[PDB]
Design a protein around this ligand. Structure first.
Ligand code: NA
Ligand code: NA
Lengths: 412, 412, 206
């Protein structure tokens, strides 16, 4: 990318309206080409929707794909396959009383069972969707504009179009919530034995009311997004064994089944049905979205967040698609010429690390809270929330607080 | 191999012929290398018996114990691992004449576990490890490539050789692979300057600065090491062409600049070298080369002074160029058909996952699951380009010379 | 069907949709015909209780035993084999309108093991076998092919029907398949002339 153009990008980021979003050719093009797209068409890709990459005369797959609330796997492990929001209904696996687990290894294997049970049902749900959509949906205009539809004389929403590449997805919501919760239990319950499982459960059941010291201790256990391998290695294994299942589903369905971390606003409703969690998040609060750090858990600057992303990925596999990655910077940290060069440098690092997506948020915490009190004076406040640009003052409290409660990196 | 043999159905019409002979071959070649090694143990015992210098006598006795164990049994330490490597690369020379002399793989990766364990247990020092490696190089320096065919001798003038040793790069998981051994190889090449081994370093977009500095220091040393190969070019091409990404990331440098995946590569035919300067001359000389007189070698493209436009002159060049390409591809295809009738490589095959799975020798034409990377050589690139550009500017554009003028100057 | 279903991988992405619904259907259709047969067994008992004639009462009672066993379980004798056949062909009419009305297959071949055994053991005579087959014909003669679509009516005018009964031919090993039952079918057609069944004979060079 030329320096002159990257500088123009940095200046747009500095303007503070949340544009542009960034997508990384060095991750996207080899993945799509390895998966079957001719290299020249892959190099010609269009960004589509939030972070996706379309080859308009090669892409053939169009089914809206399953969204998985993986925080439910965590809670169901803590609750014998139940979710408190649903009472005694058996939703997942009956992995038993969590105070019975003797070792981390046993506890983690039970997490995997819950997690894989959700994947198995998600893949089944999606395959049925793939089978049903062609009976309800057509797109004759999109088809006439599509080389392969015209060559094969098939509508784009046909299941299989010869020559096409079918990029399908399944969504991972709550990544950092799960990782941090598992890290907190591994560190404090099983390794240092500073806490028993019972104590963590009682604290969670109280929404940490009266258990603030336990909450503080869980929150200080190692967290994703700090380039701390204690947690990032958990994130990496979770992403890895998810892709192991996805490779099998790809073989059985004849399409690419790739894990994706594009939350839209799903982390709000997904968070509403999840009780307090072992990372110190309180009940009903939004889940961690995309592959960003859990709210306020990243305390080592933005490069550390990029490195946690890099080290939690599995680059010797291919069953991955987008990761939505947001980092909030204080405007003082990026002001003027020197600040633009710092934005440029972060972007070059993110590119070298082969991360898919990057979005900067440049906003002061005082500006945000000030706009909650006196909206009329901040009607020009454009921010990024759940991936899309919005007027902060038009946003719901759920989403305002989503943005407010993210770390504001100051030392850039 | 014995277990695969026991698993055949030797009552059916086909296995006893299609499969059993290959596995018998594999059983035999394992015996062959193990016999060869056990003969070195007795020889070391006999040379010890006849040696008074008592330090050498004990060296030879350690050598005898080493050769009793490897390569029949797993290496137990760095010394055994190096002697195993050595037996394999030397028996490979007995097997066949692999172009450039058999290459050595990612030595810093596969020897590192042995190296690190021995250092930590105090059974080995870095100086001792450098000594053993440098012993390897001095005996490799005594094996010289004997070309009898003049074409080979003139294509490898001066005992040309490239026993590539690969260091650095990435792991099969796509992270940087630098370790203490990677540095040791570079120190050794500066401290022990010599034309052996052909030290070759893999670079990628996240090569650490400290390692790239060590590389630069080695370059500064002025001995022409290491050569550099770019993962960021190699890995996506090889994976796009069908190599699984984890194996593509795990590639070894081989020969001069080539990239091998030792359990995926299956093509082995020496490929055509095209003298494309002949296309230029034949364009200037109605399909003749002055070295051969009136013999029509190429196409009869006519009196060159008859070309009125650069477009007509460039099309005629292309005719000459593509005529050689077509004959080169035809030549190579025949070579691909004949080589399996003459060449086999049982040792290379028994170490190849796909040869063993399919029960086929590596020099078979088609091995299911393999990727076949073949070549044709472009010689004279800048010569053709600069010549064509000169005629383009001076003769047809700036009309400062006639084709006739240029011909007579060259003829003289 | 249940075994095939237990052998699916219901953790994988596809079997639960591509294969399980079919095996569920098969399990259900097996219940359907079995339920139907069982309701006949009870109808026979109730009819027997309401029937004064002692002979017909015993007849209806043997019918109830038959309908309790077949088609749920393997037929044990000629009479159960025929009533099994009858349930399958009648339930086929409930299933669908196969052209010509459902055909009956090689009755002289698949009924012969039952017929030979009962004959030999004295539980059955050839006259009784012929009576039971003729009972089939007179109730088949009450099921009339109803074509609503005029095209079907004019392509099969006059209640055209061909519920083929196959006799004779060759065995799966290519020898002549004539047996005592083959002759019985032809005798019955002569003795009991009627437009049912559509008796069709296989001929070969031997
Ligand atoms: Na489609
Ligand atoms: Na081969």
């Amino acid at each position: 990318t030329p320096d002159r153009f990257l500088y123009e990008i940095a200046l747009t980021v500095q303007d503070g309206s949340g544009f542009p979003k960034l997508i990384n050719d060095e991750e996207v093009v080899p993945l799509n080409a390895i998966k079957g797209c001719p290299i020249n068409e892959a190099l010609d890709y269009a960004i589509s929707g939030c972070t996706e990459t379309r080859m308009p005369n090669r892409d053939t797959y169009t089914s809206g794909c399953v969204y998985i609330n993986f925080a439910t796997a965590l809670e169901m492990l803590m609750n014998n396959g139940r979710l408190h929001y649903y009472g005694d209904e058996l939703i997942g696996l009956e992995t038993g009383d969590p105070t019975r687990f003797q070792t981390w290894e046993e506890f983690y294997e039970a997490y995997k069972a819950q997690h894989i049970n959700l994947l198995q049902k998600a893949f089944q749900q999606q395959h049925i969707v793939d089978r049903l959509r062609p009976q309800h949906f057509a797109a004759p205009l999109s088809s006439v504009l599509h080389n392969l539809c015209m060559k094969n004389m098939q509508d784009l929403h046909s299941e299989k179009i010869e020559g096409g590449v079918d990029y399908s997805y399944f969504e991972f919501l709550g990544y950092a919530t799960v990782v941090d919760s598992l890290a907190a239990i591994k560190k404090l319950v099983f390794e240092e034995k500073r806490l028993t499982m019972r104590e963590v459960l009682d604290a969670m059941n109280a929404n940490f009311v009266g258990y603030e010291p336990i909450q503080e201790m869980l929150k200080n256990a190692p967290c994703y997004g700090n380039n701390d391998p204690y947690a990032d290695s958990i994130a990496k294994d979770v992403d890895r064994f998810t892709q192991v299942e996805a490779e099998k589903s790809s073989r059985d369905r004849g399409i690419h089944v790739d894990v994706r971390y594009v939350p839209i606003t799903s982390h709000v409703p997904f968070g509403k049905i999840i009780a307090a969690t072992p990372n110190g998040r309180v009940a009903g609060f939004p889940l961690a979205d995309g592959s960003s750090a859990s709210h306020g858990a990243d305390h080592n600057g933005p490069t550390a967040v990029l490195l946690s992303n890099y080290h939690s990925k599995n680059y010797g596999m291919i069953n991955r698609a987008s990761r939505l990655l947001n980092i909030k910077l204080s405007p003082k940290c990026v002001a003027g010429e020197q600040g633009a060069k710092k934005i440029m440098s972060i972007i070059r690092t993110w590119c070298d690390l082969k991360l898919w997506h990057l979005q900067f948020n440049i906003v002061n915490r005082d500006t945000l809270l000030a706009a909650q009190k006196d909206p009329n004076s901040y009607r020009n406040l454009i921010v990024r929330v759940a991936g899309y640009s919005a007027y902060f003052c038009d946003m719901s409290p759920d989403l305002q607080n989503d943005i407010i409660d993210r770390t504001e990196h100051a030392d850039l | 191999a014995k277990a695969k043999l026991a698993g055949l159905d030797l009552t059916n019409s086909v296995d006893i012929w299609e499969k059993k002979p290959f596995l018998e071959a594999m059983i035999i070649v394992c015996d062959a290398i193990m016999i060869w090694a056990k003969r070195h143990a007795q020889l070391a015992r006999d040379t010890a018996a006849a040696t008074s210098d008592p330090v050498r006598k004990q060296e030879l006795l350690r050598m005898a114990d080493i050769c009793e164990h490897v390569p029949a049994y797993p290496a137990r330490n760095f010394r055994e691992a190096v002697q195993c490597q050595w037996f394999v690369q030397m028996f490979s020379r007995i097997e066949q004449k692999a172009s450039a002399i058999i290459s050595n793989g990612r030595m810093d990766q596969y020897l590192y576990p042995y190296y690190k364990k021995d250092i930590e247990e105090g059974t080995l020092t870095s100086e001792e490890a450098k000594e053993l490696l440098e012993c390897m190089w001095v005996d490799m320096a005594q094996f010289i490539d004997l070309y009898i065919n003049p074409t080979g001798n003139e294509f490898q003038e001066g005992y040309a050789h490239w026993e590539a040793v690969t260091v650095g790069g990435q792991t099969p998981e796509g992270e940087d692979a630098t370790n203490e051994l990677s540095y040791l190889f570079l120190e050794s090449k500066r401290e022990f300057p010599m034309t052996y081994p052909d030290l070759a370093v893999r670079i990628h977009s996240r090569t650490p600065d400290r390692f790239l500095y060590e590389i630069a220091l080695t370059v500064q040393d002025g001995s022409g090491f290491p050569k550099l190969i770019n993962d960021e070019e190699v890995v996506p091409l090889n994976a796009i062409k069908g190599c699984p990404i984890n194996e593509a990331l795990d590639y070894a440098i081989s020969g001069c600049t080539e990239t091998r995946m030792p359990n995926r590569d299956t093509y082995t035919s020496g490929c055509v070298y095209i003298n494309f300067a002949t296309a230029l001359e034949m364009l200037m000389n109605n399909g003749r080369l002055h070295y051969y007189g009136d013999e029509l070698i190429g196409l009869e493209t006519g009196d060159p002074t008859r070309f009125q436009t650069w477009e007509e002159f460039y099309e005629a060049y292309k005719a000459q160029h593509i005529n050689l390409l077509q004959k080169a591809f035809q030549q190579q295809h025949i070579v691909d058909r004949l080589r399996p009738q003459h060449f086999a490589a049982p040792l290379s095959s028994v170490l190849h996952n796909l040869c063993m799975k399919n029960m086929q020798d590596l020099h078979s034409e088609k091995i299911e699951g393999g990727v076949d990377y073949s070549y044709f050589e472009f010689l004279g690139y800048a010569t053709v380009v600069d010549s064509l550009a000169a005629i383009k500017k001076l003769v047809f554009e700036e009309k400062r010379l006639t084709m006739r003028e240029v011909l007579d100057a060259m003829n003289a």
